[PDB]
Design an enzyme around this catalytic site. Structure first.
Site, PDB file in Angstrom:
ATOM      1  N   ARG A 104     -16.731 -22.092 -11.144  1.00 21.19           N
ATOM      2  CA  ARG A 104     -17.629 -21.579 -12.164  1.00 21.19           C
ATOM      3  C   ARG A 104     -18.659 -22.681 -12.436  1.00 21.19           C
ATOM      4  NH1 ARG A 104     -12.895 -21.650 -15.539  1.00 21.19           N
ATOM      5  NH2 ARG A 104     -12.763 -23.497 -16.902  1.00 21.19           N
ATOM      6  N   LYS A 126     -28.098 -11.380  -1.461  1.00 14.53           N
ATOM      7  CA  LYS A 126     -26.675 -11.663  -1.449  1.00 14.53           C
ATOM      8  C   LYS A 126     -25.998 -10.914  -2.593  1.00 14.53           C
ATOM      9  CE  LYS A 126     -24.341 -15.653  -1.015  1.00 14.53           C
ATOM     10  NZ  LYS A 126     -23.019 -16.322  -0.872  1.00 14.53           N
ATOM     11  N   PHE A 161     -22.135 -25.280  -0.554  1.00 12.65           N
ATOM     12  CA  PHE A 161     -21.614 -26.558  -0.102  1.00 12.65           C
ATOM     13  C   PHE A 161     -22.669 -27.635  -0.285  1.00 12.65           C
ATOM     14  CE2 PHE A 161     -21.077 -29.943   3.042  1.00 12.65           C
ATOM     15  CZ  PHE A 161     -19.875 -30.451   2.554  1.00 12.65           C
ATOM     16  N   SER A 164     -28.309 -23.034  -3.683  1.00 13.70           N
ATOM     17  CA  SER A 164     -28.547 -21.958  -4.648  1.00 13.70           C
ATOM     18  C   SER A 164     -29.294 -23.057  -5.391  1.00 13.70           C
ATOM     19  CB  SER A 164     -27.380 -21.436  -5.460  1.00 13.70           C
ATOM     20  OG  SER A 164     -27.368 -20.018  -5.268  1.00 13.70           O
ATOM     21  N   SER A 214     -25.400 -11.796  -7.212  1.00 15.71           N
ATOM     22  CA  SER A 214     -23.944 -11.841  -7.103  1.00 15.71           C
ATOM     23  C   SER A 214     -23.162 -12.998  -7.725  1.00 15.71           C
ATOM     24  CB  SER A 214     -23.568 -11.744  -5.620  1.00 15.71           C
ATOM     25  OG  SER A 214     -24.251 -12.715  -4.842  1.00 15.71           O
ATOM     26  N   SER A 215     -23.836 -14.058  -8.156  1.00 16.86           N
ATOM     27  CA  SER A 215     -23.120 -15.183  -8.765  1.00 16.86           C
ATOM     28  C   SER A 215     -22.260 -14.757  -9.958  1.00 16.86           C
ATOM     29  CB  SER A 215     -24.098 -16.255  -9.239  1.00 16.86           C
ATOM     30  OG  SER A 215     -23.425 -17.227 -10.030  1.00 16.86           O
ATOM     31  N   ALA A 274     -23.756 -20.810   1.461  1.00 16.15           N
ATOM     32  CA  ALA A 274     -24.402 -21.492   0.344  1.00 16.15           C
ATOM     33  C   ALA A 274     -23.334 -21.995  -0.610  1.00 16.15           C
ATOM     34  CB  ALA A 274     -25.342 -20.540  -0.387  1.00 16.15           C
ATOM     35  N   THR A 318     -14.760 -21.944   2.253  1.00 15.99           N
ATOM     36  CA  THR A 318     -13.412 -22.313   1.829  1.00 15.99           C
ATOM     37  C   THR A 318     -12.501 -22.764   2.968  1.00 15.99           C
ATOM     38  OG1 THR A 318     -13.567 -20.809  -0.064  1.00 15.99           O
ATOM     39  CG2 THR A 318     -11.369 -21.576   0.510  1.00 15.99           C
ATOM     40  N   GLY A 377     -12.052 -17.691  -0.280  1.00 12.52           N
ATOM     41  CA  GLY A 377     -10.925 -17.995   0.583  1.00 12.52           C
ATOM     42  C   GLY A 377     -10.237 -16.779   1.162  1.00 12.52           C
TER      43      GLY A 377
HETATM   44  C1  LIG Z   1     -17.206 -24.188  -4.714  1.00 11.74           C
HETATM   45  C2  LIG Z   1     -18.144 -23.025  -4.329  1.00 11.74           C
HETATM   46  C3  LIG Z   1     -19.484 -23.003  -4.650  1.00 11.74           C
HETATM   47  C4  LIG Z   1     -20.393 -21.920  -4.277  1.00 11.74           C
HETATM   48  N1  LIG Z   1     -21.733 -21.944  -4.605  1.00 11.74           N
HETATM   49  C5  LIG Z   1     -22.531 -20.935  -4.228  1.00 11.74           C
HETATM   50  C6  LIG Z   1     -23.961 -20.948  -4.532  1.00 11.74           C
HETATM   51  O1  LIG Z   1     -24.495 -21.893  -5.142  1.00 11.74           O
HETATM   52  N2  LIG Z   1     -24.713 -19.887  -4.123  1.00 11.74           N
HETATM   53  C7  LIG Z   1     -24.186 -18.759  -3.416  1.00 11.74           C
HETATM   54  O2  LIG Z   1     -24.960 -17.882  -3.109  1.00 11.74           O
HETATM   55  N3  LIG Z   1     -22.841 -18.756  -3.133  1.00 11.74           N
HETATM   56  C8  LIG Z   1     -22.030 -19.739  -3.497  1.00 11.74           C
HETATM   57  N4  LIG Z   1     -20.683 -19.737  -3.182  1.00 11.74           N
HETATM   58  C9  LIG Z   1     -20.097 -18.577  -2.448  1.00 11.74           C
HETATM   59  C10 LIG Z   1     -20.049 -18.732  -0.936  1.00 11.74           C
HETATM   60  O3  LIG Z   1     -21.385 -18.786  -0.404  1.00 11.74           O
HETATM   61  C11 LIG Z   1     -19.364 -17.532  -0.250  1.00 11.74           C
HETATM   62  O4  LIG Z   1     -20.109 -16.318  -0.576  1.00 11.74           O
HETATM   63  C12 LIG Z   1     -17.906 -17.297  -0.686  1.00 11.74           C
HETATM   64  O5  LIG Z   1     -17.223 -18.545  -0.994  1.00 11.74           O
HETATM   65  C13 LIG Z   1     -17.069 -16.567   0.334  1.00 11.74           C
HETATM   66  O6  LIG Z   1     -16.841 -17.342   1.520  1.00 11.74           O
HETATM   67  P1  LIG Z   1     -15.553 -18.256   1.806  1.00 11.74           P
HETATM   68  O7  LIG Z   1     -14.344 -17.423   1.365  1.00 11.74           O
HETATM   69  O8  LIG Z   1     -15.611 -18.585   3.269  1.00 11.74           O
HETATM   70  O9  LIG Z   1     -15.747 -19.503   0.937  1.00 11.74           O
HETATM   71  C14 LIG Z   1     -19.800 -20.793  -3.566  1.00 11.74           C
HETATM   72  C15 LIG Z   1     -18.427 -20.840  -3.243  1.00 11.74           C
HETATM   73  C16 LIG Z   1     -17.578 -21.880  -3.593  1.00 11.74           C
HETATM   74  C17 LIG Z   1     -16.135 -21.793  -3.183  1.00 11.74           C
HETATM   75  C1  LIG Z   2     -10.940 -31.808   0.237  1.00 15.44           C
HETATM   76  C2  LIG Z   2     -12.160 -30.993  -0.203  1.00 15.44           C
HETATM   77  C3  LIG Z   2     -13.424 -31.028   0.528  1.00 15.44           C
HETATM   78  C4  LIG Z   2     -13.785 -31.783   1.786  1.00 15.44           C
HETATM   79  C5  LIG Z   2     -14.263 -31.020   2.920  1.00 15.44           C
HETATM   80  C6  LIG Z   2     -14.624 -31.659   4.148  1.00 15.44           C
HETATM   81  C7  LIG Z   2     -14.506 -33.114   4.251  1.00 15.44           C
HETATM   82  C8  LIG Z   2     -14.887 -33.828   5.562  1.00 15.44           C
HETATM   83  C9  LIG Z   2     -16.220 -33.564   6.111  1.00 15.44           C
HETATM   84  C10 LIG Z   2     -16.649 -34.190   7.328  1.00 15.44           C
HETATM   85  C11 LIG Z   2     -15.760 -35.090   8.018  1.00 15.44           C
HETATM   86  C12 LIG Z   2     -14.451 -35.356   7.489  1.00 15.44           C
HETATM   87  C13 LIG Z   2     -13.995 -34.743   6.272  1.00 15.44           C
HETATM   88  F1  LIG Z   2     -12.905 -34.985   5.862  1.00 15.44           F
HETATM   89  C14 LIG Z   2     -14.026 -33.855   3.104  1.00 15.44           C
HETATM   90  C15 LIG Z   2     -13.660 -33.241   1.868  1.00 15.44           C
HETATM   91  N1  LIG Z   2     -14.516 -30.255   0.081  1.00 15.44           N
HETATM   92  C16 LIG Z   2     -14.476 -29.462  -1.027  1.00 15.44           C
HETATM   93  C17 LIG Z   2     -15.670 -28.711  -1.383  1.00 15.44           C
HETATM   94  C18 LIG Z   2     -15.673 -27.850  -2.533  1.00 15.44           C
HETATM   95  C19 LIG Z   2     -14.457 -27.745  -3.331  1.00 15.44           C
HETATM   96  F2  LIG Z   2     -14.426 -27.007  -4.323  1.00 15.44           F
HETATM   97  C20 LIG Z   2     -13.296 -28.486  -2.973  1.00 15.44           C
HETATM   98  C21 LIG Z   2     -13.258 -29.354  -1.824  1.00 15.44           C
HETATM   99  C22 LIG Z   2     -12.101 -30.148  -1.396  1.00 15.44           C
HETATM  100  C23 LIG Z   2     -10.811 -30.069  -2.194  1.00 15.44           C
HETATM  101  O1  LIG Z   2      -9.834 -29.477  -1.845  1.00 15.44           O
HETATM  102  O2  LIG Z   2     -10.830 -30.729  -3.372  1.00 15.44           O
HETATM  103  O1  LIG Z   3     -22.941 -22.109  -8.954  1.00 11.68           O
HETATM  104  C1  LIG Z   3     -22.160 -21.194  -9.142  1.00 11.68           C
HETATM  105  O2  LIG Z   3     -21.426 -20.966 -10.133  1.00 11.68           O
HETATM  106  C2  LIG Z   3     -21.940 -20.086  -8.118  1.00 11.68           C
HETATM  107  C3  LIG Z   3     -22.976 -19.323  -7.683  1.00 11.68           C
HETATM  108  C4  LIG Z   3     -22.699 -18.271  -6.699  1.00 11.68           C
HETATM  109  O3  LIG Z   3     -23.556 -17.534  -6.245  1.00 11.68           O
HETATM  110  N1  LIG Z   3     -21.357 -18.163  -6.300  1.00 11.68           N
HETATM  111  C5  LIG Z   3     -20.292 -18.943  -6.746  1.00 11.68           C
HETATM  112  O4  LIG Z   3     -19.149 -18.771  -6.338  1.00 11.68           O
HETATM  113  N2  LIG Z   3     -20.613 -19.933  -7.687  1.00 11.68           N
END
Ligand SMILES: Cc1cc2nc3c(=O)[nH]c(=O)nc-3n(C[C@H](O)[C@H](O)[C@H](O)COP(=O)(O)O)c2cc1C
Ligand SMILES: Cc1c(-c2ccc(-c3ccccc3F)cc2)nc2ccc(F)cc2c1C(=O)O
Ligand SMILES: O=C(O)c1cc(=O)[nH]c(=O)[nH]1
Ligand code: NA
Ligand code: NI
EC number: 1.3.5.2
Length: 351
Positions: free
Chosen positions: A109, A210, A61, A83, A177-178, A59, A312, A261
């Site tokens: 955030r 979650k 993305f 979310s 958990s947010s 979630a 990530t 990450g």
């Molecule tokens: C930019 C970003 C936005 C996220 N938004 C949500 C969200 O809206 N709801 C949620 O449950 N988790 C959210 N997450 C958390 C991810 O679902 C996941 O629990 C967490 O990033 C750990 O996985 P990863 O290290 O593979 O990213 C978000 C994470 C990132 C990096």
């Molecule tokens: C580059 C990137 C992308 C992304 C991922 C996949 C693609 C993509 C997808 C499909 C096919 C080709 C592609 F390049 C393109 C762009 N998604 C994000 C999401 C959240 C965030 F916080 C940061 C990022 C960032 C970043 O480093 O600024």
């Molecule tokens: O939208 C957000 O701030 C958010 C929600 C969540 O559950 N996890 C996260 O990393 N961000």
């Protein structure tokens, strides 16, 4: 090809755009399909559904269900939307997304920037037919339900999410958990399950909780206790962390929010083991946190996960990472004696 994306494309995008802009661009590109085989070993049956492969997109993305089909096209076994909050809300003021390249990490955030139930429901219903087929083919859809920042009744917010998107979901997810006791949690989840049980003319979706990786010993016992008490269908471990591990090199590590990450990789797996033991391996677990390879995936599954999710890794490695993780997971399972993914679930605890 993995090299082109990791060394050139993704790095190129990172120098041309700020993380939030890239995120939005990622969604556009993915929903348009300008993108481009699961063996039976990866097939997992759990939560009353069939998953062709155990690697889903976490979630966060696709917050508003704009690129579901594009995501499955990238190779995901399942997609988890948003979310999503009842009313629309802009979220925290920008900048709110920060990149930690050297750590292969991110810090966000967002504050639940969401289009709302009405919009997501409209979008998802428009493709309900296509998804019906997808689900039947082992490509389930999950919907992560949130609550508004100013909402007065948390339970009422989630319950409304269950009523509006429950008919469209294969499984639902409630956050806690947010980036409060055993009683307040029990009341919130019982009202959610009650709303879920109240659904009609639709297949009842599983309900998962979650949790964050930042929990006290009591928090984990309480969560495990209530989950088994209410009959929660599952748990998603883990969400982002507020702690900043010693060793972070990124200049923006001091930024407030949740860290995702590689830095979260092992903390996420250890939480999985702990929750799996506290629930006696009776509650299916979706492992997430720093998955970047088939091996990271296998460590999560052996710790007790039935499915895994990533986000990530995709940010830095791109689409190829999904293919690589599944390929490696399959190769590793063979090499370690598991005839199927299911055989490796909880292997750590079985000794
Ligand atoms: C930019 C970003 C936005 C996220 N938004 C949500 C969200 O809206 N709801 C949620 O449950 N988790 C959210 N997450 C958390 C991810 O679902 C996941 O629990 C967490 O990033 C750990 O996985 P990863 O290290 O593979 O990213 C978000 C994470 C990132 C990096
Ligand atoms: C580059 C990137 C992308 C992304 C991922 C996949 C693609 C993509 C997808 C499909 C096919 C080709 C592609 F390049 C393109 C762009 N998604 C994000 C999401 C959240 C965030 F916080 C940061 C990022 C960032 C970043 O480093 O600024
Ligand atoms: O939208 C957000 O701030 C958010 C929600 C969540 O559950 N996890 C996260 O990393 N961000
Ligand atoms: Na243990
Ligand atoms: Ni349903």
């Amino acid at each position: 090809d993995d090299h082109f994306y990791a060394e050139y494309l993704m790095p190129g995008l990172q120098r041309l755009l700020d993380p939030e802009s890239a995120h939005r661009l990622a969604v556009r590109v993915t929903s348009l399909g300008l993108l481009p085989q699961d063996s039976d070993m990866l097939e997992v049956k759990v939560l009353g559904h069939k998953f062709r492969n155990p690697v889903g997109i976490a979630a966060g993305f696709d917050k508003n269900g704009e690129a579901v089909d594009g995501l499955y096209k990238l190779g995901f076994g399942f997609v988890e939307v948003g979310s999503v909050t009842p009313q629309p809300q802009e979220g925290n003021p920008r900048p709110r997304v920060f990149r930690l390249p050297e750590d292969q990490a991110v810090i966000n955030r967002y504050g639940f920037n969401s289009h709302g139930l009405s919009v997501v429901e409209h979008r998802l219903r428009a493709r309900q037919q296509k998804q019906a087929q997808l689900t039947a083919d082992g490509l389930p859809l999950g919907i992560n339900l949130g609550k508004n920042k100013t909402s007065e009744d948390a339970a009422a917010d989630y319950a409304e999410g269950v009523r509006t998107l429950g008919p469209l979901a294969d499984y639902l997810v409630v956050n806690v958990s947010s980036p409060q006791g055993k009683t307040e949690l029990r009341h919130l989840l019982s009202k959610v399950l009650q709303e879920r049980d109240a659904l009609k003319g639709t297949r009842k979706p599983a309900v998962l909780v979650k949790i964050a990786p930042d929990l006290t010993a009591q928090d984990k016992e309480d969560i495990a206790s209530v989950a088994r008490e209410l009959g929660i269908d599952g748990l998603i471990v883990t969400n982002t962390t507020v702690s900043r591990p010693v060793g972070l090199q990124g200049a923006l590590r001091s930024e407030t929010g949740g860290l995702s990450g590689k830095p979260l990789r092992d903390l996420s797996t250890q939480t999985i083991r702990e929750m799996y033991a506290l629930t006696q391996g009776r509650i299916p677990i979706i492992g997430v946190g720093g998955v970047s390879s088939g091996q990271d995936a296998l460590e999560k599954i052996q710790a007790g996960a039935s499915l895994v999710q990533l986000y990530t890794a995709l940010i830095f490695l791109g689409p190829p990472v999904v293919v690589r993780v599944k390929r490696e997971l399959e190769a590793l399972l063979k090499e370690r004696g598991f005839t199927t993914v299911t055989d490796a679930i909880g292997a750590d605890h079985r000794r």
